[PDB]
């Protein structure tokens, strides 16, 4: 009875005709109230005579709320027609958003709830949804648009079209996006919009997996991607208006389950989540003209406007602030921004940063120009947020960046914990893989059979303690000095990633050792540690007898808790989709190596093709320079006549815009679109560089481009793989930028 | 003992030398820890030997926390030197932000707390603050900047300068904005930065007013503006490093008290708060090139980036949504945006809007182009957020917009409630004031002596009920029909601004009238009301005997609560600063009328001056066209030589950039800057329009501009005030845009 509008004929004699429109949220209910009492404007349509509304967004108080209005009995089983004819409504029709959230959450729980208790209602048809168009394309002529209920049904349409300069493509992911014209239009044919769920005897196991525990089988299920619906499946759905449970659950609620765990766990190619990749791409795009200081809320507003960030601002502001912190033992070891201001210190974990009204930010632009090179950002797959081009799917850096900066996730949802690796020990291994004159190039012999002779040990940069390997795990230690005059113990270095004030409180709470120490003061600097622990008198002789001299840990380093264990949970997201757990750090590096050399081969192949057709166009223009006298265009002022004349004298037609600036185009689109254009690389000249003193320029340009094409053709013939000698120069420029940044305190003066 | 670092010599024998740096927040404490243990890099500076730190997170647990570390006794009075020499520190030194918040809140409460209990400590000097530069200007040459502690001390500096093309002006409103170089630089001279508070025997009454109740005297105090410090006062403060309590409280904590009540109460010129004025100016700036659709979070990100909005996004998103709702009885009656989507309905108060990920927005551009005309946005005073030009101080519309759209504030902080006024009754009164042939132009005879013959009654648009005046107040009524067959009462119209679902719950809670009715169902449309109240049998004869037939209210309209009283609290903000309460709606209109005609006079005077110097420049160029033959500049290729030659032949030097585009410049800046420039309106020609076929163009342009100057000179000589005939045409275009919008449901097709 909460937000429930009762139908007129509900519970009476014609209660087998009624529907119960079950909307999620509260704006969907406003759309339904607009559509149901639409009036005399459509006589053949629904109304409140046979439709009632109830809200959702609640085994809770809400799922016991539709039971009270349908008259459902838990003890019944509803097998025959006369036994399920004592319900107060004919069916339920769900009204959810077309986005990742509504069809994953509300429909998924409602179907699982009906399958758990009354599975004979999904059979014979009682749970229905209604689906509203996703994409509408509007012509500049006619008023009735062309509508698509799935995105693949739009991709199969617009691929077969001409230039879409007269069409407006418009996406509708939520029910609050439909205008009054088109919400009036959807309630013309309300009955051609209601689909029915069915069972297929695989839904038993699939409802067992995704809902109701069994986390082992969910971890076995979410390892692969989200395979979208094929063409014959969508045609078979539209033919009979019946959708199976297993297709909707596999496609439309696996995708929610993967969307929820992809904003916590980072991709393993670049080490970023989705929001951090938005921040990096918006920072590359923002600071490209002038590298001027922007404040943090202004750069956050830029990223929200231009990279389509729709999850609040305080998450965005703390992600902008968190990335640019450079204290000892921070999350980023190679930050992508420069923190002009006060971004917090090591003592309370970066939580004492300034307000984002006051602090500023700017790019690194010597690190970020060299780690993520700009001529490979045109070869990466991108995401599309409602038809507009946002951030890429994944960057591929030069050096394996998922194991270089160490960070965890600040939640107890999913397990993820990375400790950094030695830069001097990843560079030796990468340059053993790439270079052929590097004497340890038998790495290939044990990159397959795992026979590993080069090491990867943890970072120990910005760390004055010790790291020791005890059997299987590494341990970090702190340092201390003892004054045997006035018995103050001075703590000078805590172990890795341990903030100071939480350490002080952890000594405060342990009462078995608070009964020895008297007073404790933190006189530390902003980046070093100096803690005085003043002990009670006659204490040092008996704390040795309480806390024993173990070989792994002496008497003081368990008295003051100066030992840390480096547990490491390596759970990552695949590029195509899924979840992968790795179990050593060698495997993350091995996976990274295959992907990067294919970007070297792709961008060299792309450059080779573009140089081919640049040379073709410039040779054609020089040939027009030679015999320009035999073309009296002064009386050929009609464009089609000069076009037909130039078609006779062997000149090729060229799409000159796509030759000058190939913008995110692939190799095959360059091959099949650059030869279909007009003759406006000749018939659009200034007639100012047509003389002799500019022909030498174009002959020299052809000379430079031909030499560069010979250079690219000898780069693609190398050993061990194409583009190898390009990638060593990139490694050297990266490590010079990192070395120039480490001895400037990452300010780059 | 909460976040307290004990000074090293505190409480001992040299405890008269120590300081207690009391920082607000937690980033200030990181700055102080960076500065105190700065090391051997300055030997003559503070350290932890004689300085301790304590935080001020917030008569509480924190103000009893500095008592415990200073050793303050409530019963003592601390009059003589030997009685205040038993404290554990020498003084307290406050470290607060230079912004509106820190110096208003934390210093204000700390000074009031010390004045309430130990007033003999402010005398003889115990409460000190620390002053950090506000503005630094950096030269492209030298490295040491020029520093300013007050803003007036910067305005008196930069006014006396030359062109600031080699200086970078940089503002520091918060303590987290100081870089490493300059936080190291401020701790060189730490002792030239600590100022001491003193009493002046007016602070007794001023501490009595602002702190500790007495809201009557605060309402009497905040009626005027915030008069900033004069030059001789700041020089007298810097001479002896003593600041009075009364100057800091009057200037720096009145300003916080006015900043807090200026984001709730709107200005009376335009009817907007500060955030809504940011949204309007950013919407005018965003949708100016192409009036496309932008989603609400993208337009919010634009306003945060370009108009300097620093108060979160959900306040901004709900203000963008409330600025475009157009249901019956909404806040805006003339919304400034067009709501492409679903922005909520009248039934639950417009709080059932869509998510701002999905809904879109665009400008009105026929209303907003005519109410706020674009050639007066260059004559309004603006605000400056850290040296950059944000939103104006106040718009001045055409029609008095504070009394046309009715809205309240959704809080119990300050009283503000406006009910709209009849458009047909404000237009008659404004056009009686402006026009001289309008026969009721004796409005001037009783705009002074208040003798009022034209009325202002409430709106009754989008309202099907009744409005009746009973003595002093207006009352709104609802409608109903009674079926004497099956005793359902059908409610068809609720009174003004009353949402439906809250009305239903208000009938549900009253148990003395729920004992008669038994069902109540809501079959309303999106914009009309239809509620069925199904009563128990034999009920209608006795509800007449419970609820009497008063002349003001019959038996049904107090049974169903269909009567509303129109209380109206008219509290507004002045343009200069302050709080004004008005007590009728005539007075708001009278105040608005004087301001608008001075903008007509200002923009006509501005246009007159610009046309004068445009005619001067174009006449000079035509004179150069005449005798261009007598200037052989072919061997005068040196620019200074041709400049000195053109200075001889009567040609005036003109700043041509400021003549072509006068950008926010006043009349006197046009008069004293347009005559000091170079001769590059002649010596920068294309030499393509120098021939005969372009001289006719410039002679015709001089003809048009001379006719327009005669038109402006006869507009400034009118009656009753200059620019009167310009303002009637604006009223007619406004009311045609409003009439074109009311019968399109404010979609403007």
Domains of chain B in sequence order: 4-132+172-260 (3.40.50.670), 466-565 (3.30.1360.40), 593-715 (1.10.268.10)
- Give the span between the Cα atoms of B329 and A336, in whole angstroms: 51
Query: Binding site annotation covers B155?
Result: no
Secondary structure of residue A204 in the 3-state scheme: helix
* B341 contact residues in A (CB cutoff 8 A): 176-179
Nearest by CB to residue B355, choosing from A174, A341, A351, is A174
Query: Dihedral (C-alpha) A577, A579, A583, A585: value to the nearest 10 degrees?
Result: 40
Question: DSSP string spanning A318-347?
Answer: HHHHHHT--STT-S-SS-SEE--S----GG
B353 contacts on A by Cβ (under 8 Å) = 27, 176
Contact B37 A525 (CB under 8 A): yes
Which among B101, B318, B353, B357 is the top mutation candidate for probing chain A, defined by the most A β-carbons within 10 Å of its own β-carbon?
B357
Look at B301 and A304 and tell me if their CB atoms are within 8 Å. yes
Cα separation, A506 vs B594, in Å, equals: 68
Q: In this complex, do A305 and B313 lie within 8 Å of one another by their Cβ atoms?
A: no
Nearest CA in chain A to B38: A525
In angstroms, how far apart are the furthest CA atoms of chain A? 113
Cβ of B27 and A353 within 8 Å? yes
B53, B10 contact by CB (below 8 A) = no
Number of Cβ within a 10 Å radius of residue A12: 11
Which one-letter DSSP state was computed for residue A97? Answer: -
Three-state DSSP state, A106? helix
Give the list of residues 6+ apart from residue A741 with CB closer than 8 angstroms, or none: A334, A364, A366, A367, A748
SS3 B385: strand
For residue A306, the chain B residue with the least C-alpha distance is: B298
Contact, A372 vs A397, CB < 8 A? yes
What is d(CA A7, CA A353) in angstroms, rounded to the nearest whole number?
56
Helices (H), B445-499: none
Pull the structure tokens for residue A182. Answer: 């088109």
State the smallest CA–CA distance between residue A203 and chain B in angstroms: 32
Give CA–CA dist A628/B156, Å, rounded: 68
Q: What's the token pair of residue B34?
A: 């960076």
Q: What is the DSSP string of B337-374?
A: EE--S----GGGTT--PPPTTT-EEEE-SSSHHHHS-G
User: Is A299 exposed, middle or buried, given 0-12, 13-18 or 19+ CB atoms closer than 10 A?
Assistant: buried
d(CA A654, CA A679): 7
Closest CA to A187 of A71, A39, A17, A359: A39
**CA-to-CA distance for B503 and B564, rounded, in angstroms?**
12
- The nearest alpha carbon in chain B to A29 belongs to B352
Closest-CA residue of A relative to B338 is A179
Contacts of B311 in chain A (CB under 8 A): none
Instruction: Determine contact, residues A152/A234, Cβ cutoff 8 Å.
Output: yes
Chain A residues touching residue B321 (CB < 8 angstroms): none
Known catalytic residue at B171: no
**Mutation to test the A interface, candidates B177, B362, B504, B521, most A Cβ within 10 Å:** B177
Q: Which of B321, B333, B609, B628 is nearest to B460 (CA)?
A: B333
The DSSP secondary-structure symbol of A443 reads G
Q: Pick B176's closest partner by Cβ from A308, A347, A359.
A: A359
The answer to whether A130 touches A194, Cβ cutoff 8 Å, is yes
Nearest to A177 among B304, B347, B358 (CB): B358
Residue in B283, B304, B327 to test binding to A, most A beta-carbons within 10 Å = B304
Distance of CA A691 to the CA centre of its chain: 54
Interatomic CA distance for residues B296 and B222, integer angstroms: 36
State the nearest Cα–Cα gap between B523 and chain A, in angstroms: 7
Breaks in chain B after residues, C-to-N cutoff 2.5 Å: 58, 451
**Tokens linked to B506:** 């208000």
CA distance linking residue A657 with residue A646, whole number of Å: 19
CB contact under 8 A, B179 and A340: yes
Answer whether B358 sits within 8 Å of A176, measured CB to CB: yes
CA angle B703, B705, B708 (to 5 degrees): 110
Of all residues in chain A, the one with the smallest CA distance to B172 is: A358
Task: List, in sequence order, every residue forming a beta bridge with B129; answer none if it has no partner.
Answer: B94, B195
Q: How far is CA A490 from the centre of its chain?
A: 46
Whose tokens are 């490491």? That residue is A568
Is the Cβ pair A352, B30 closer than 8 Å?
Answer: yes
SS3 of A713, please?
A: helix
Asked whether the beta carbons of A289 and A134 are under 8 A apart, the reply is no
Note whether B270 and B402 are within 8 A (CB).
yes
- Chain B partners of A522 at a C-beta cutoff of 8 Å? 5
What is the distance in angstroms between the Cα of B35 and the nearest Cα belonging to chain A? 9
Chain B hits for A301, CB-CB cut-off 8 Å, are: 300-306, 309
- Judged by phi (left if over 0) then psi (alpha if -120 to 50, else beta), residue A42 lies in beta
Distances (CA, A) of A318 to A275, A276, A344, A496, A594: 11, 11, 12, 22, 34
Residues from chain B that touch A178, judged by Cβ atoms under 8 A, are 341-342
DSSP states along B63-124? TTHHHHHHT--SS----STTTSSSSSSSEEEEE--SSTTHHHHHHHHHHHHHHHH-HHHHTT
Cα diameter, chain B: 113
Contacts within 8 Å (CB) and 24+ apart, A613-617: A613/A654, A613/A659, A613/A670, A613/A674, A614/A659, A614/A705, A615/A702, A615/A705, A615/A706, A615/A709, A616/A652, A616/A654, A617/A654, A617/A656, A617/A659, A617/A681
B352 to A173: CB separation less than 8 angstroms, yes or no: no
CA distance A606 to A615: 14
- What distance, in Å, lies between the first and last C-alpha atoms of chain A? 67
β-bridge partners, B147:
B136
Catalytic residue among B309, B358, B406, B585: B358
Out of A27, A355, A524, closest to residue B352 by CB: A27
Q: Which residues contact A514 (CB under 8 A, 6 or more apart)?
A: A507, A508
Residue indicated by tokens 């980036």: B305
Query: What's A452's DSSP letter?
Result: -
Q: Which residues of A touch B298 (CB under 8 A)?
A: 304-305, 308
C-beta atoms of A302 and B301 within 8 A: yes
**Count of pairs with CB atoms under 8 A, one residue in A, one in B:** 161
**H helical segments located in A535-638:** 540-546, 556-559, 585-626
Q: What gap in Å lies between CA A721 and CA A481, rounded to an integer?
A: 55
Q: B269 to chain A, minimum CA–CA distance in Å?
A: 29
* Contact call for residues A523 and A504 (beta carbons, < 8 A): no
**Residues constituting chain A:** 749
Give the resolution in Å. Answer: 3.3
């Amino acid at each position: 009875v909460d937000k429930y509008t009762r139908a007129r004929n509900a519970g009476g004699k014609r209660a087998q005709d009624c529907m119960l429109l079950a909307a999620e949220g509260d704006s969907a209910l406003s759309l339904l109230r607009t559509g149901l009492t639409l009036g005399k404007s459509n006589p053949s349509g629904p109304s409140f005579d046979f439709c009632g509304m109830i809200s959702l967004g609640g085994n809770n108080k809400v799922l016991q709320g539709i039971v009270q209005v349908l008259g459902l009995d838990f003890n019944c089983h509803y097998k025959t027609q006369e036994e399920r004819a004592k319900l107060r409504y004919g069916c339920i029709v769900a009204c959810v958003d077309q986005d990742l959230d509504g069809c994953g959450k509300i429909l998924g729980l409602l179907l699982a709830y009906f399958h758990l208790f009354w599975p004979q209602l999904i059979i014979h048809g009682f749970v229905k949804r209604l689906l509203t168009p996703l994409i509408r394309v509007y012509e500049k002529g006619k008023t009735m648009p062309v509508e698509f209920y799935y995105e693949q049904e739009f991709d199969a349409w617009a691929k077969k079209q001409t230039s879409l300069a007269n069409h407006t493509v418009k996406y509708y992911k939520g029910l609050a996006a439909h205008d009054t014209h088109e919400v009036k239009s959807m309630f013309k044919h309300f009955d051609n919009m209601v689909y029915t769920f069915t069972l297929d005897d695989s839904a038993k196991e699939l409802f067992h997996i995704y809902f109701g525990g069994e986390s082992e089988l969910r971890k076995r299920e979410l390892c692969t991607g989200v395979v979208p619906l094929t063409e014959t499946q969508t045609q078979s759905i539209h033919s009979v208006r019946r959708i199976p449970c297993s297709l909707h659950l596999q496609v439309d609620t696996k995708a929610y389950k993967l969307d929820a765990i992809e904003r916590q766990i980072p991709n393993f190619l670049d080490g970023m989540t989705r929001a951090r990749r938005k921040i990096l791409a918006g920072g590359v795009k923002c600071f490209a003209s002038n590298n001027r200081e922007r404040k943090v809320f202004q750069f956050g507003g830029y990223v929200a406007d231009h990279m389509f960030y729709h999850h609040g601002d305080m998450s965005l502001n703390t992600s902008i602030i968190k990335a640019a912190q450079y204290y000892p033992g921070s999350s980023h070891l190679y930050p992508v921004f420069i923190g002009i201001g006060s971004f917090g210190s090591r003592h309370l974990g970066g939580k004492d940063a300034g307000s984002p009204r006051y602090i500023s930010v700017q790019l690194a632009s010597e690190f970020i120009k060299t780690m993520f090179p700009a001529e490979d950002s045109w070869l990466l797959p991108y995401v599309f947020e409602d038809g507009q081009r946002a951030e890429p799917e994944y960057y591929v850096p030069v050096l394996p960046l998922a194991i270089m900066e160490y960070g965890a996730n600040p939640s107890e949802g999913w397990k993820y914990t990375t400790w950094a690796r030695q830069l001097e020990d990843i560079l030796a291994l990468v340059r053993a893989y790439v270079d052929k004159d590097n004497p340890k190039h038998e790495l290939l012999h044990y990159a397959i059979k795992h026979k590993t002779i080069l090491p990867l040990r943890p970072s120990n940069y910005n760390f004055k303690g010790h790291l020791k390997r005890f059997g299987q795990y590494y341990y970090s230690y702190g340092t201390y000095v003892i004054s045997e005059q006035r018995n103050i113990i001075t703590i000078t270095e805590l172990p890795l990633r341990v903030p100071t004030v939480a350490y002080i409180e952890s000594i405060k709470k342990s009462s078995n050792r608070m009964t020895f120490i008297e007073e404790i003061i933190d006189y530390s600097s902003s980046e070093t540690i100096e803690i005085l622990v003043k002990l009670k008198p006659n204490s040092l002789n008996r704390i040795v007898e309480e806390f024993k001299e173990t070989e792994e840990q002496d008497s003081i380093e368990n008295f003051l808790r100066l030992r840390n264990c480096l547990h490491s949970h390596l759970n990552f997201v695949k590029p195509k989709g899924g979840i992968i757990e790795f179990n050593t750090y060698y495997e993350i590096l091995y996976a990274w190596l295959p992907y990067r050399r294919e970007l070297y081969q792709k961008r060299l192949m792309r450059e080779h093709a573009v140089l081919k057709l640049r040379i073709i166009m410039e040779t054609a223009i020089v040939r027009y320079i030679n015999e320009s006298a035999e073309l009296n265009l002064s009386h050929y002022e009609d464009e089609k006549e000069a076009s037909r004349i130039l078609s006779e004298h062997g000149f090729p037609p060229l799409n000159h815009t796509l030759i000058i600036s190939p913008e995110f185009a692939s190799i095959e689109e360059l091959n099949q679109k650059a030869l279909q254009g007009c003759y406006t690389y000749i018939l659009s000249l200034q007639a100012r560089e047509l003389l002799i003193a500019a022909k030498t320029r174009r002959v020299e340009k052809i000379k430079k481009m031909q030499a560069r094409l010979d250079k690219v053709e000898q780069l693609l013939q190398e050993s061990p793989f194409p583009g190898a000698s390009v990638w060593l120069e990139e490694i050297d420029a990266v490590e010079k930028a990192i070395i120039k940044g480490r001895n400037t305190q990452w300010k780059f003066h």
